[PDB]
Amino acid sequence: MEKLPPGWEKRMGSGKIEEGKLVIWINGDKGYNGLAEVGKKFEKDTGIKVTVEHPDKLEEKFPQVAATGDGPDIIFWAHDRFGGYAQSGLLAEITPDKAFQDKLYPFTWDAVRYNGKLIAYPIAVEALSLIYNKDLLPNPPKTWEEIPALDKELKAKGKSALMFNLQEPYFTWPLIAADGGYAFKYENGKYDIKDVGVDNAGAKAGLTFLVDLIKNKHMNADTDYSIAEAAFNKGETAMTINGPWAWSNIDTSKVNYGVTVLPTFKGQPSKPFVGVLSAGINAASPNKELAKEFLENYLLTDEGLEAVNKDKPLGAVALKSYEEELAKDPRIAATMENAQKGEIMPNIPQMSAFWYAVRTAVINAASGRQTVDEALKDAQ
Ligand SMILES: OC[C@H]1O[C@H](O[C@H]2[C@H](O)[C@@H](O)[C@@H](O)O[C@@H]2CO)[C@H](O)[C@@H](O)[C@@H]1O
């Protein structure tokens, strides 16, 4: 027998993030190449190489991988996941000086506050819009209710009315919330985790309309991000539902498209969840100063955001100076019109489970594995 030797816990350990460089995680639907260009700028000014990666399921991996040799110095995701990360102590506190704070809309900072700390930098405000083919559909529908009839008409030309991703609850949430579905009730400065609205009559009606759309063969339960994107970008479906990031690929397809208000349901506006794309610094990073310099002086500038935006559009950006130029874009006006009708996502730790529950519920209802009532009861 011997005592455990020095550094044993490091031999049995998961490693350490490398000092002297920057590793960034951002989702694969975002402008990671443009972000790498920013990285390149940072490198030639500082010598510090910036590596940008878009792993799959990064928002799920981060809490297991954060404090390991594979953890990134900087993580990008919509602000909803960050409260969970903060509670898990995964996030370094963010300390921008006053002059820097003033450069971003104050309400974007609020989106990245958890328990009276700033736990990330806000980048851009995101929301879904109805994206339509102006040649197939010069006047897109104002109501969800008229979509089945519109589909039948388009099927006579070997076309369809609507395809969008049915594997992520994010995309059908605007329908679910329209007549009163909600995640967590907000009452007096606080989210009440005991008051969940995925099971009420608004949610049910919304999800039922989706299920009927599928049953009546206006939509297919198996449609995902890729299938719906190809279909719209090839001119096979008249409308899709997506965010600003999706606009680059449509530009390339030379489909003649518009971005407009989502259709109403039961006379009520569709209420898409609003996400603020945010950048957090890893608590286990030994490069926190570099990360701060990168985010504040390279990314969050007119030149930095543009580089990313040109790769894949960001939405309404948190940086005032550059947003004034993006605000003129009709697609951004539409984006903001849809966001305004919806609601910002909660950032509470319970979001992650909420999302998984709602994801499961939609997939099961659409597949017929469960009725709407059974699925949403399970979720609640
Ligand atoms: O579907 C659940 C999912 O919704 C949101 O994810 C969005 C994200 O906000 C967008 O930036 C874009 O990448 O599409 C995603 C949906 O596929 C939540 O932010 C995410 O936490 C949640 O799991």
Coordinates of C-alpha atoms and ligand atoms in Angstrom, one line a residue:
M1 CA 0.0 0.0 0.0
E2 CA 1.0 3.6 -0.8
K3 CA -0.5 7.0 -0.3
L4 CA -2.1 8.6 -3.4
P5 CA 0.7 10.4 -5.3
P6 CA 0.8 14.1 -6.2
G7 CA -1.2 14.9 -9.3
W8 CA -3.2 11.6 -9.2
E9 CA -6.4 13.5 -9.6
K10 CA -5.0 15.1 -12.7
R11 CA -4.1 11.7 -14.2
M12 CA -7.6 10.5 -13.5
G13 CA -8.9 13.9 -14.7
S14 CA -10.5 15.4 -17.8
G15 CA -7.7 17.9 -18.6
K16 CA -7.4 21.7 -18.8
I17 CA -8.3 24.2 -21.4
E18 CA -5.1 25.4 -23.2
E19 CA -3.5 28.7 -22.2
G20 CA -2.5 31.2 -24.9
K21 CA -5.3 30.6 -27.5
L22 CA -9.0 30.9 -27.8
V23 CA -11.5 28.1 -28.5
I24 CA -15.1 29.2 -29.4
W25 CA -18.3 27.2 -29.6
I26 CA -21.1 28.5 -31.8
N27 CA -24.1 26.7 -33.3
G28 CA -23.8 25.3 -36.8
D29 CA -26.7 27.4 -38.1
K30 CA -24.9 30.6 -37.3
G31 CA -22.1 32.5 -39.2
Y32 CA -19.1 30.6 -37.8
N33 CA -17.0 31.3 -40.8
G34 CA -17.5 35.0 -40.5
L35 CA -16.7 34.7 -36.8
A36 CA -13.5 33.0 -37.8
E37 CA -12.6 36.0 -39.9
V38 CA -13.0 38.1 -36.8
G39 CA -10.7 35.6 -35.1
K40 CA -8.2 36.0 -37.9
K41 CA -8.2 39.8 -37.2
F42 CA -7.7 39.1 -33.6
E43 CA -4.7 36.8 -34.4
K44 CA -2.8 39.3 -36.5
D45 CA -3.2 42.0 -33.9
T46 CA -2.3 39.8 -30.9
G47 CA -0.7 36.6 -32.2
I48 CA -3.4 34.7 -30.4
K49 CA -5.0 32.0 -32.6
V50 CA -8.8 31.7 -32.5
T51 CA -10.4 28.4 -33.2
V52 CA -14.1 28.3 -34.0
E53 CA -16.0 25.0 -33.7
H54 CA -19.6 24.1 -34.2
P55 CA -20.0 20.7 -32.4
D56 CA -23.4 19.0 -32.5
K57 CA -25.5 19.3 -29.3
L58 CA -23.1 21.9 -27.9
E59 CA -25.7 23.3 -25.6
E60 CA -26.1 19.8 -24.1
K61 CA -22.4 19.0 -23.9
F62 CA -21.2 22.2 -22.4
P63 CA -22.0 21.4 -18.7
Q64 CA -20.2 18.0 -18.9
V65 CA -17.3 19.3 -21.1
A66 CA -16.9 22.9 -19.8
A67 CA -14.3 22.2 -17.2
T68 CA -12.4 19.7 -19.3
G69 CA -9.6 19.9 -21.9
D70 CA -12.2 20.1 -24.6
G71 CA -14.2 23.0 -23.1
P72 CA -14.3 26.2 -25.0
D73 CA -13.1 29.6 -23.7
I74 CA -16.2 31.2 -25.2
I75 CA -19.7 29.6 -25.7
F76 CA -22.4 31.1 -27.9
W77 CA -26.1 30.2 -27.5
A78 CA -29.4 32.0 -27.0
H79 CA -29.6 33.4 -23.5
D80 CA -32.2 30.8 -22.3
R81 CA -29.6 28.1 -21.5
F82 CA -27.3 30.5 -19.5
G83 CA -29.1 30.6 -16.2
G84 CA -28.6 26.8 -15.9
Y85 CA -25.0 27.3 -16.8
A86 CA -24.6 30.1 -14.2
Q87 CA -26.3 28.0 -11.4
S88 CA -23.8 25.2 -12.3
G89 CA -21.0 27.7 -11.8
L90 CA -19.9 27.3 -15.4
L91 CA -19.7 31.0 -16.3
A92 CA -17.2 33.7 -15.5
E93 CA -18.8 36.9 -14.4
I94 CA -18.8 39.6 -17.1
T95 CA -17.5 43.0 -16.1
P96 CA -17.7 45.5 -19.0
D97 CA -16.8 49.1 -18.1
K98 CA -19.5 51.7 -18.2
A99 CA -18.6 53.1 -21.6
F100 CA -18.8 49.6 -23.1
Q101 CA -22.2 48.9 -21.5
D102 CA -23.6 52.1 -23.0
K103 CA -22.7 50.7 -26.4
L104 CA -25.3 47.9 -26.1
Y105 CA -29.1 48.3 -25.6
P106 CA -29.7 48.0 -21.8
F107 CA -32.5 45.6 -22.2
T108 CA -30.1 43.2 -24.0
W109 CA -27.8 43.2 -21.0
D110 CA -30.9 42.3 -18.9
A111 CA -31.4 39.2 -21.0
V112 CA -28.0 37.9 -19.7
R113 CA -28.5 38.7 -16.0
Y114 CA -28.9 35.7 -13.7
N115 CA -29.3 36.3 -9.9
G116 CA -28.0 39.9 -10.2
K117 CA -24.9 39.0 -12.2
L118 CA -24.1 39.5 -15.9
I119 CA -23.1 36.1 -17.1
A120 CA -22.6 36.7 -20.8
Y121 CA -22.4 39.4 -23.5
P122 CA -25.6 39.9 -25.6
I123 CA -25.0 39.8 -29.4
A124 CA -28.3 39.9 -31.3
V125 CA -32.1 39.6 -30.8
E126 CA -33.6 36.6 -32.7
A127 CA -37.2 35.7 -33.7
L128 CA -38.9 33.5 -36.3
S129 CA -40.9 35.0 -39.1
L130 CA -43.0 33.7 -41.9
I131 CA -40.8 33.4 -45.0
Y132 CA -42.6 33.1 -48.3
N133 CA -42.0 32.7 -52.0
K134 CA -43.3 35.9 -53.6
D135 CA -43.7 34.2 -57.0
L136 CA -45.8 31.3 -55.7
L137 CA -47.6 33.4 -53.1
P138 CA -47.6 37.2 -53.7
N139 CA -50.1 37.5 -50.9
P140 CA -49.2 35.2 -48.0
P141 CA -52.0 34.2 -45.6
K142 CA -52.8 36.2 -42.5
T143 CA -54.2 33.2 -40.6
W144 CA -53.1 29.7 -39.9
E145 CA -56.7 28.6 -40.5
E146 CA -56.5 29.3 -44.3
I147 CA -53.3 27.3 -44.7
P148 CA -55.0 23.9 -45.4
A149 CA -57.1 25.3 -48.2
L150 CA -54.0 27.1 -49.6
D151 CA -52.1 23.8 -49.5
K152 CA -54.8 21.9 -51.5
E153 CA -54.6 24.7 -54.1
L154 CA -50.8 24.4 -54.4
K155 CA -50.8 20.6 -54.4
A156 CA -52.6 20.9 -57.8
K157 CA -49.4 22.4 -59.1
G158 CA -47.3 19.8 -57.3
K159 CA -46.4 22.4 -54.7
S160 CA -47.1 22.7 -50.9
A161 CA -48.1 25.6 -48.7
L162 CA -45.8 25.2 -45.7
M163 CA -42.8 23.2 -44.5
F164 CA -40.8 24.0 -41.4
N165 CA -38.7 22.0 -38.8
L166 CA -40.9 19.8 -36.7
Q167 CA -38.1 18.2 -34.7
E168 CA -37.4 21.3 -32.5
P169 CA -40.3 22.7 -30.4
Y170 CA -38.8 26.2 -31.0
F171 CA -40.4 26.3 -34.4
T172 CA -44.0 25.3 -33.5
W173 CA -43.9 27.3 -30.2
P174 CA -45.4 30.4 -31.9
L175 CA -48.5 28.4 -32.7
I176 CA -48.6 26.8 -29.3
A177 CA -48.4 30.2 -27.5
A178 CA -50.8 32.1 -29.9
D179 CA -54.0 31.1 -28.1
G180 CA -52.4 31.1 -24.6
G181 CA -49.7 28.4 -24.3
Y182 CA -46.7 29.5 -22.1
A183 CA -43.6 28.1 -20.5
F184 CA -43.3 29.6 -17.1
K185 CA -45.6 32.3 -15.8
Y186 CA -44.0 35.7 -15.1
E187 CA -45.4 37.4 -12.0
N188 CA -43.8 40.3 -10.1
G189 CA -40.2 40.2 -11.3
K190 CA -40.0 36.4 -11.0
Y191 CA -40.7 33.2 -13.0
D192 CA -42.9 30.8 -11.1
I193 CA -41.7 27.2 -11.8
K194 CA -45.0 25.8 -10.4
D195 CA -47.0 27.7 -13.0
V196 CA -46.5 26.0 -16.4
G197 CA -48.8 26.5 -19.4
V198 CA -47.9 23.8 -21.9
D199 CA -51.1 21.9 -21.0
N200 CA -53.8 24.6 -21.1
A201 CA -56.4 25.2 -23.8
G202 CA -54.2 27.6 -25.8
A203 CA -51.4 25.0 -26.1
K204 CA -53.7 22.2 -26.9
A205 CA -55.5 24.0 -29.7
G206 CA -52.2 25.1 -31.1
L207 CA -50.7 21.6 -31.1
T208 CA -54.0 20.1 -32.4
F209 CA -53.9 22.4 -35.4
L210 CA -50.3 21.2 -36.1
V211 CA -51.4 17.6 -35.7
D212 CA -54.5 18.0 -38.0
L213 CA -52.2 19.7 -40.6
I214 CA -50.1 16.5 -40.5
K215 CA -53.1 14.1 -40.5
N216 CA -54.6 16.0 -43.5
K217 CA -51.3 15.6 -45.2
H218 CA -50.5 19.3 -45.4
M219 CA -47.3 18.6 -43.5
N220 CA -45.1 15.6 -42.7
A221 CA -44.1 14.6 -39.2
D222 CA -40.6 13.7 -40.3
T223 CA -39.7 17.2 -41.7
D224 CA -36.6 18.7 -40.1
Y225 CA -34.4 21.8 -40.5
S226 CA -32.7 20.4 -43.6
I227 CA -35.7 19.0 -45.4
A228 CA -37.8 22.2 -44.9
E229 CA -34.8 24.4 -46.0
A230 CA -34.2 22.5 -49.2
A231 CA -37.9 22.4 -50.0
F232 CA -38.3 26.2 -49.7
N233 CA -35.0 27.0 -51.3
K234 CA -35.8 24.8 -54.3
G235 CA -39.3 26.3 -54.8
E236 CA -41.3 23.2 -53.8
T237 CA -43.1 24.8 -50.8
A238 CA -44.5 28.3 -50.8
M239 CA -43.7 29.2 -47.2
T240 CA -41.3 28.2 -44.4
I241 CA -40.8 29.4 -40.8
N242 CA -37.2 30.3 -39.8
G243 CA -35.0 33.0 -38.3
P244 CA -32.5 35.5 -39.7
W245 CA -29.7 33.0 -39.9
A246 CA -31.6 31.2 -42.6
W247 CA -31.6 34.2 -45.1
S248 CA -28.1 33.6 -46.5
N249 CA -29.0 30.3 -48.1
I250 CA -32.2 31.6 -49.5
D251 CA -30.3 34.5 -51.1
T252 CA -28.1 31.9 -52.9
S253 CA -31.1 29.8 -54.1
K254 CA -32.4 32.9 -55.9
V255 CA -35.9 32.1 -54.8
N256 CA -37.8 35.4 -54.7
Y257 CA -38.6 35.6 -51.0
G258 CA -40.2 38.0 -48.5
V259 CA -40.1 38.0 -44.7
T260 CA -43.4 38.9 -43.0
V261 CA -45.6 38.6 -39.9
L262 CA -46.5 35.1 -38.8
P263 CA -50.2 34.1 -39.4
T264 CA -52.6 34.6 -36.5
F265 CA -54.3 31.7 -34.8
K266 CA -57.8 32.0 -33.4
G267 CA -57.5 35.7 -34.1
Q268 CA -54.4 35.9 -31.9
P269 CA -50.9 36.8 -33.2
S270 CA -48.4 33.9 -33.3
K271 CA -46.0 34.4 -30.4
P272 CA -42.5 33.3 -31.2
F273 CA -40.1 32.9 -28.3
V274 CA -37.4 35.6 -28.5
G275 CA -33.8 34.6 -28.0
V276 CA -30.8 36.8 -27.5
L277 CA -27.7 35.2 -29.0
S278 CA -25.2 35.5 -26.2
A279 CA -21.5 34.8 -25.6
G280 CA -20.4 33.5 -22.2
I281 CA -16.9 33.1 -21.0
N282 CA -16.0 29.7 -19.4
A283 CA -15.2 29.9 -15.7
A284 CA -12.6 27.2 -16.3
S285 CA -10.8 29.2 -19.0
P286 CA -7.3 30.5 -18.3
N287 CA -7.9 33.0 -21.1
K288 CA -10.6 35.2 -19.6
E289 CA -8.8 38.5 -20.4
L290 CA -8.2 37.5 -24.1
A291 CA -11.8 36.4 -24.3
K292 CA -13.0 39.8 -22.9
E293 CA -10.7 41.6 -25.4
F294 CA -11.9 39.5 -28.3
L295 CA -15.6 40.0 -27.5
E296 CA -15.6 43.6 -26.6
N297 CA -13.0 45.1 -29.0
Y298 CA -13.2 42.7 -31.9
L299 CA -16.7 41.1 -32.1
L300 CA -18.9 43.7 -30.6
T301 CA -17.9 46.4 -33.1
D302 CA -19.4 47.6 -36.4
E303 CA -16.7 45.7 -38.3
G304 CA -17.0 42.5 -36.2
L305 CA -20.7 42.0 -36.3
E306 CA -20.9 42.8 -40.0
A307 CA -18.3 40.1 -40.8
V308 CA -20.5 37.6 -38.9
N309 CA -23.7 39.1 -40.3
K310 CA -22.5 38.8 -43.9
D311 CA -21.9 35.1 -43.4
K312 CA -25.3 34.5 -41.7
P313 CA -27.6 37.3 -40.6
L314 CA -27.8 37.9 -36.8
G315 CA -31.1 39.7 -36.4
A316 CA -31.4 42.9 -34.5
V317 CA -27.9 43.3 -33.0
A318 CA -27.3 44.5 -29.5
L319 CA -24.7 47.0 -30.6
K320 CA -26.5 50.4 -31.1
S321 CA -24.3 51.9 -33.8
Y322 CA -24.6 48.9 -36.1
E323 CA -28.2 48.2 -35.4
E324 CA -29.2 51.5 -36.9
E325 CA -27.9 50.3 -40.2
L326 CA -29.6 46.9 -39.9
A327 CA -32.9 48.4 -38.7
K328 CA -33.6 49.7 -42.2
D329 CA -33.8 46.1 -43.6
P330 CA -37.5 45.1 -44.1
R331 CA -36.6 41.6 -43.1
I332 CA -35.3 43.0 -39.7
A333 CA -38.5 45.1 -39.3
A334 CA -40.5 42.0 -39.8
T335 CA -38.2 40.1 -37.5
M336 CA -38.8 42.7 -34.8
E337 CA -42.6 42.8 -35.5
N338 CA -42.7 39.1 -34.8
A339 CA -40.5 39.4 -31.7
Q340 CA -42.6 42.2 -30.3
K341 CA -45.7 40.0 -30.5
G342 CA -43.9 37.1 -28.8
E343 CA -42.0 37.0 -25.6
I344 CA -38.4 36.7 -24.4
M345 CA -37.4 33.3 -23.3
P346 CA -37.0 32.7 -19.5
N347 CA -33.4 31.9 -18.6
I348 CA -34.1 29.9 -15.5
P349 CA -32.3 26.6 -14.9
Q350 CA -35.6 24.7 -15.6
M351 CA -35.6 25.7 -19.3
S352 CA -33.5 22.8 -20.4
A353 CA -36.0 20.2 -19.0
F354 CA -38.9 22.3 -20.2
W355 CA -37.5 22.2 -23.7
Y356 CA -36.9 18.4 -23.7
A357 CA -40.4 17.8 -22.4
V358 CA -42.0 20.1 -25.1
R359 CA -39.7 18.6 -27.8
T360 CA -40.9 15.1 -26.8
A361 CA -44.5 16.1 -26.7
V362 CA -44.6 17.6 -30.2
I363 CA -42.7 14.7 -31.8
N364 CA -45.0 12.2 -30.2
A365 CA -48.2 14.1 -31.1
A366 CA -47.1 14.6 -34.7
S367 CA -46.1 10.9 -35.0
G368 CA -49.3 9.7 -33.4
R369 CA -47.4 8.0 -30.6
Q370 CA -49.6 10.1 -28.3
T371 CA -52.7 12.2 -28.5
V372 CA -52.2 15.9 -28.0
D373 CA -53.8 15.7 -24.5
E374 CA -51.6 12.8 -23.5
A375 CA -48.4 14.4 -24.8
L376 CA -49.0 17.8 -23.2
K377 CA -50.1 16.3 -19.9
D378 CA -46.8 14.4 -19.9
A379 CA -44.9 17.6 -20.6
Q380 CA -46.7 19.6 -17.8
Ligands
LIG1 O1 -36.3 23.9 -29.8 C1 -35.8 24.1 -28.5 C2 -34.6 25.0 -28.6 O2 -35.1 26.3 -29.0 C3 -34.1 27.4 -29.0 O3 -33.1 27.1 -29.9 C4 -33.1 27.8 -31.1 C5 -32.0 28.9 -31.0 O4 -32.5 29.9 -30.1 C6 -31.9 29.6 -32.3 O5 -30.8 30.5 -32.2 C7 -31.7 28.6 -33.5 O6 -30.4 28.1 -33.4 O7 -32.6 27.6 -33.4 C8 -32.7 26.9 -32.2 C9 -33.8 25.8 -32.3 O8 -33.4 24.8 -33.2 C10 -33.5 27.5 -27.6 O9 -32.6 28.6 -27.6 C11 -32.8 26.2 -27.2 O10 -32.3 26.3 -25.9 C12 -33.9 25.1 -27.2 O11 -33.4 23.8 -26.9

